[PDB]
Symmetry: D2
């Protein structure tokens, strides 16, 4: 890992439309903060309704029939994506540092993980651009029938702050590969890295209007996008609460298509024949990864009674050893939480666990005088009815539960309104096959956790969302299907 | 066509749950009418919220892990669909007669067209039951990744009155093929035929709770389904207006998945090099088919100016000769409209057509002293700004417009919030291709119209809906994708 | 009562013909050695007639070419219904001609035939071509047209089933067929020809020529107007087919040949389950199965235990009259196979393999052979390298997982393999390392109409069953058209 | 287009095994000639049987389970292909010059056409590396069943001289994308450019033994590959005659898998309603492209009788204006034929045509006193029975035939043992659709010719070959299918 610039200069902080930088129409700005210190990094243009309208107009004009973007060879769309990746890899060190500065996550993780996954995602979809075929169809009668897979059109894309650059790539990848145009609303907490990528989108050679980015708040710029009469489709990643607002706004306006990637309360199931060392460490990673700020965090650690006590012991020891501090320090495993609001929600959730009957085993408090650092926390003997067991905490707070049978654990794991992910640790073929089938979750990991691949779809069952990102499946929401049926003189096989 | 019983007995008129017939909890009933005579056929149980709750309860139970329906071989689901089709074919005469009694469409059409399409749809999806594969995926690292295409679960299906049996089949086909369970709410105007099919579903061998049917009204039974906390997915076919309500109810409850098949104002474009005779007869069929009550009716007939006058004259002559009358008469081409409400609505739009300066060329009034018959009506010299050019009439009212260039006609045809279908009539290869590409419609017919194939998807762009039915694409909405990612000792290609 | 034979001639254009030469060959009941009846002996001239009728039926604009794809599917389903109608009869006739136990014919073979035909009935109108976003102002798409006149040559071990595996995909995709059934078991396929006619398939779409290999079979392989050949049988003949294809008109070729499939029992396997499945893996259908687990690799820590149970089970296996419900194992198909198996057993004894049970003739009438088990078999022994195709089990000892992989893969065959273990990692590693077209885990001989089957290496090329089964029966055509202005 | 060095230096002229350069075991070398001057460029190592054995052993070693190439992420195979493309583009000017020196084709063509098509092919298949999924299958019973798409193994690839670089790419692209290893035998007439690419393959980062290249002759090196006991698959492009020898060798040896791309006599059909200017120029291109040395050349130009006389006059005019000379000169449209053998073969067919009674309208003789240049030649009033109408000439020799009806031209066009390609020129939709359906050809062009796309498959019907190259279809022949069926405790949908 290369030595970072621990004070990266910010170059982009305005609204991005038609490959040009603009102030908000209202000329207002908003600050973004370094969560490791609480100090303002810079000001950023605050986009609102009128700024979104301009963006949507630029997108619509870029998507017009006969335009450079509509006529561009599909294979060339692929090259542009590949070019965008090369530019990002060129500025990898800068982008990882800036990612850390604005989000809080350890620089080493931003560099080796986040940036790596951004590149793999973009390079994967570069390859899909000219391979997502429609069909020729042997319909009855003297007819020739076939389908075109056309772009859905103007796509509103609203993303969260936990993985700023990665969330942007999961959005742009499929959308651009299939020839759509984009109006993207980045999180107010973490707008900087995505704005710089906007500049690279320009340098890459994407026609103006194809990607537009409006920094700003949710109920303003986000809402204006979800209710816009000329936005054909919206993709939203964030809280379940706002996911319902997006869905309602879509139906209330123009019936735009919607996919949603929401929260979760994912069960990590450790069977009694599991490799203890592997399972303990992976359970740790499953919860504490990215300051616990991960949609699919293994926040319900079910442990078979035969190994419960030993597992808790080692999980506490590992937790107590987790290094918390400055994200630019190569030794830090956990940076601060994203902002003050998160910081306090988490602390609140810890208090409920204490009063509700959970056994605090370690941590449970503030870890530093400055920034938003929280001590790695582990709760023992958690019950399904407890608050910390049912609600997404989005912090370094671990829930260790206890079970006896496979049939018990399936029922308790599935007794949730969430269904984003699940995992099973066991050496037994039958138990593995049975659990992964029985569990209601979009992703079931076996003997591992948080294994993401650009090739494999990701998304939620139930209230954890609808639709899927990554893989071939991620192309589906960005495709409008047209059937063409033609009368022919004489149909032959 | 075999001689029908013009007074078919009614055997099924209650609520269908767990393969059993029940009265409404409230014991309330509602009348369904013969549109040809305006007389009441029989009373039908009026299902409401509580009856929906029982249906969902039964559907959830049937969908439980380890149930007969979840463990049944995919191939055997196919056989069951095939058995249902065979039973329907056995009772074809009866069902076609009952369809005509309750809906109004010509008995000859019910038999040779509707029933035929019901059989073709069910047999088509019987073949998909064991063929909609998931994927094995070459993900990075030492992992084996694959997807399961599981059923989405409890599916609410809400259908209209214009093709009662066919609409039922378009819904059951893909849903049962992929192992889902159904709570279906049929149109209050035409509940009878679908209820008798429920008897065939039972006779066929489908497990109890797999298909449940609740006859009743929209804002009561329909809204209860759309807002139900334990319904996983809703498929709605009907008006654009109610489509908004469905989408809102989804987001306002449990984020159930939504697909919508709505209305349209489909352009039918006649180029100056078209076969006049063929184009006139097809334009007639495109509008007047099924009493004009077709989502994708060609209700904007664009004709190139060099052939406009001749086209109009011939179109008028054909409309004047269209036989309107008793649906059981083998000579009738057009029965009555479905009910009083639709009847008045069409007459209302004809008034608006006169008031706004559209040239009334034939018909324009009531066509009988009993029932809901309307004279085939043709408006000429129609302009884009007119109401009859913009709104879905859903009656035997034809609009003929004039255009000059290809450029012009593409823009005018696309200048609409609808986009369900469109057609192009020409002998020119390039014109056919440019148009089929330029048109924003889910189906584009060339030198033909209303050609539906079980193999070819159908659905709308824009506010004509979202998602597709028929073909392989019809399976997508009824599938929930699960990624399983397993750690392996050593990954090899 | 034995089933009466109704069909014993050459089937062309939905009509029954004698051979041009008027020659006939007898077919025999292997349980008694007695002649069942005479059968028309097709040769080159009869093949030429069948091919001509096939070509005519495939002509552009013909009823079969113009027929809706969905309707081809209905025809397949109707053919299935008729077979099920006559299920009892076909099962019995299958037993009479082949030798396999009647109960197995009825519950297994006939069941698998119905599932195959009904599965492919559903594919008829679902095998889409593609529309393709090519560079430039062009629109590009592909058609999946039928390959054309398809010669199909099949073996005697599962006569109805092999027929179905061939007809299913060929007919679903609109091809026409000239089929050459095995001389040892021609009867049941000929009765199905009558059903094909009853179901309503147009004349010339399916033609069946009974006869011998070097005559009727070679005439099909070398024919100048046959577009595609599909052969199931011995590796030796598979080579002949291939050469004939190249030497003639370059017709497309797929092959399903023999094997020497390893069945691998790890030390943590379910012992009872493993023993029963290993027994079935080898002895099923008188051992006359291409994918028979004829190399049973057993981990050393459970070797003796496995062997003892395996020998006990083999000694309880009932051999005799296939129409007797007690019978688990009927006779071998004919005298040549009978003698050949006895020969292999002798090499086993001579080469130092340990005869644990059987080894001899099991009846003084018919071609019955005792269930036989060899222990301590070495990789270099004849019975370990060559296909026996009889009720002769080889049990080999191994120690490590890396060892069994190397030894299992050290073969010119690669049709099938199996692994018995409770361990997730061992199962996944082995199923990946093994060079076999089908890898069973904790089961054996599990065939699905939905899942492809075929060999690596010299066990064949191409796959049958599943979607993959349609590939070899499809010819791809690209149509690329200039358009005024390409848009996404 | 950069001015080339007309005398480019040769850096590679040995055998390429395990990323190393080797002299032949025999130390034998063969000279390769500049077809434009008849002069020796340089000597090249002559591979034979023992050199093939070494290459195959190296390929087998590289393909061994657990090797770097087998364990390499599919995504990384994709990255390597892209790197190879970049290096080829980096050295584009040099490769274009060397191609022309060894083959004879115009440098402008080598640069703008061949090199461009190479880059597109490799970059296309780069995207496939991690997207060619196997399936998860809903088999009957309590089982989980799926397929793996594994590589076929050691692939012998034998290529011709007409498109040396392009043919290499069409082979390496799909083979490498799917993780196979290659032993490639390049044409003895044009070994130079493929050997340089080997150097780039090494520079790109492909593991040693993954691609091995053996220059040498057909019946020696080529046959050694076709008959090798340890080669799993062979793909051959060349003459139908040798195609039969390859197929026989496969069956006589180890039953390796075989795909063939052979010659043809493709019909170019000009309807009376075609655009004359466009049809004439495209018909010219279709035949004369690449000195006529193109497998799918339109060497049977059927022209409807009403436009025959005019079409012929303009074709002859265009033929007489075609510039023949030095390939490096920018005005040159036609270079020399590849070698002396092809030179005499073409003079033979020209003489055959004259003695057969075909009307010689222009050319028909030698065009220069040095090199192998042949005058553009046009024969008129060609009949189906003529030899020049049936056999592949592979030279600048055009045949023009007359026809009357569409039904007639179909029969005459299909009456051939070849079926590689065909074209139709017309403005009529119906004629285009009927013909494209009726013609027995692997590729049918409509109002265009020689339009190749990396996305669209190419291959012959009948004796023009078997299997397809390019597109997704090109991956099939390089994939071995494995079904894995696992017993599970309880199967659910
Ligand atoms: N792969 C299998 O499922 C299978 C089936 C039967 C036999 N076998 C093996 O083959 C051995 C002998 O059996 P067999 O002789 O019946 O098999 P075979 O390969 O000789 O016969 C298979 C089919 O091909 C035909 N045939 C034979 N010679 C031919 C030729 N020269 N040209 C064209 N077609 C020809 C036969 O008539 C028969 O219908 C057995 O010991 C067994 O090991 C394998
Ligand atoms: Mg919020
Ligand atoms: Mg209403
Ligand atoms: Mg033989
Ligand atoms: Mg030669
Ligand atoms: Na921030
Ligand atoms: Na009614
Ligand atoms: Na027999
Ligand atoms: Na040369």
């Amino acid at each position: 890992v290369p030595a970072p610039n621990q004070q990266p200069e910010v170059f982009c902080n305005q609204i991005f439309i038609n490959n040009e930088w603009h102030d908000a129409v209202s000329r207002k700005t908003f600050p973004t903060v370094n969560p490791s210190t609480g100090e303002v990094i810079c000001q950023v243009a605050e986009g609102d309704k009128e700024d979104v309208d301009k963006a949507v107009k630029a997108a619509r004009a870029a998507f017009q029939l006969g335009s450079p973007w509509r006529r561009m060879d599909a294979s060339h769309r692929g090259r542009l994506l590949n070019r965008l990746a090369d530019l990002i890899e060129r500025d990898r060190t800068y982008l990882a540092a800036l990612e850390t500065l604005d989000n809080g996550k350890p620089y080493v993780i931003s560099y080796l993980v986040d940036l790596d996954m951004v590149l793999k995602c973009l390079r994967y979809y570069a390859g899909w651009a000219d391979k997502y075929h429609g069909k020729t169809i042997p319909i009855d009668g003297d007819f020739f029938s076939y389908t075109r897979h056309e772009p859905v059109g103007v796509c509103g894309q609203i993303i969260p702050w936990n993985f700023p650059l990665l969330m942007q790539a999961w959005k742009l990848g499929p959308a651009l590969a299939t020839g759509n145009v984009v109006v993207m609303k980045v999180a107010e907490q973490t707008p900087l890295t995505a704005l710089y990528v906007a500049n690279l989108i320009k340098e890459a050679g994407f026609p103006p209007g194809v990607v537009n980015i409006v920094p700003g708040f949710g109920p303003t710029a986000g809402a204006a996008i979800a209710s816009h009469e000329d936005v054909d489709k919206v993709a939203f990643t964030g809280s379940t609460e706002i996911g319902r607002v997006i869905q309602v706004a879509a139906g209330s306006s123009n019936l735009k298509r919607v996919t949603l990637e929401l929260g979760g309360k994912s069960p990590n199931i450790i069977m009694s024949d599991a490799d203890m060392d592997w399972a303990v460490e992976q359970a740790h990673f499953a919860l504490f990864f990215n300051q616990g700020q991960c949609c699919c965090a293994g926040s319900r650690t079910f442990v078979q009674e035969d190994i419960y006590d030993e597992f808790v012991e080692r999980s506490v020891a590992r937790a107590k050893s987790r290094v918390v501090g400055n994200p630019f320090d190569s030794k830090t495993e956990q940076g601060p939480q994203v902002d003050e609001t998160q910081f306090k929600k988490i602390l609140g959730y810890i208090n409920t666990g204490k009063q509700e009957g959970a056994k605090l085993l370690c941590g449970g408090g503030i870890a530093a005088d400055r920034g938003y650092f929280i001590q790695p926390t582990v709760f023992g003997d958690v019950q399904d009815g407890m608050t910390i067991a049912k609600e997404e905490i989005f912090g370094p707070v671990m829930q260790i539960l206890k079970f006896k049978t496979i049939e018990e654990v399936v029922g308790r794991a599935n007794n949730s309104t969430y269904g984003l992910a699940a995992a099973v640790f066991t050496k037994d073929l039958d138990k593995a096959n049975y659990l992964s089938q029985a569990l209601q979750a979009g992703t079931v990991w076996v003997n591992c956790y948080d294994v993401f691949g650009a090739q494999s779809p990701f998304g939620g069952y139930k209230m954890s969302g609808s639709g899927r990102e990554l893989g071939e499946y991620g192309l589906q929401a960005y495709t409008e299907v047209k059937t063409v049926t033609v009368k022919v003189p004489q149909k032959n096989s």
